[PDB]
């Protein structure tokens, strides 16, 4: 499947999940990383999207 991916802020550890989005900022569940506008930042420390690393997750 086109699995939904997890991305971890390299500065504070916050994790964005494509499956959940970030509704408080208008980012719908299912929003893929490349489709998030660049005005968005880590909600917990302000780091830019470029400061995230994709997380490898196990099969489910
Ligand atoms: Fe952060
Ligand atoms: Zn797959
Ligand atoms: Zn896209
Ligand atoms: Zn915006
Ligand atoms: Zn940065």
UniProtKB/TrEMBL annotation:
Checking Gene3D superfamilies in the record gives:
2.20.28.10
Q: Name one GO molecular function term.
A: electron transfer activity
Q: Binding of Zn(2+) 7: at which residues?
A: 39, 53
Domain Rubredoxin-like span(s) in chain numbering: 4-55
Top-level division of the source organism's lineage = Bacteria
* UniProt-annotated binding residues for Zn(2+) 5: 38, 51
Kindly list the positions annotated as binding Zn(2+) 1: 1, 3
Binding sites annotated in the UniProt record for Zn(2+) 8: 51
Entry-linked PANTHER family = RUBREDOXIN, RUBREDOXIN-1-RELATED
Q: What is this protein called?
A: Rubredoxin
This chain's source organism reads: Mycobacterium tuberculosis (strain ATCC 25618 / H37Rv)
Q: Which gene encodes it?
A: rubB
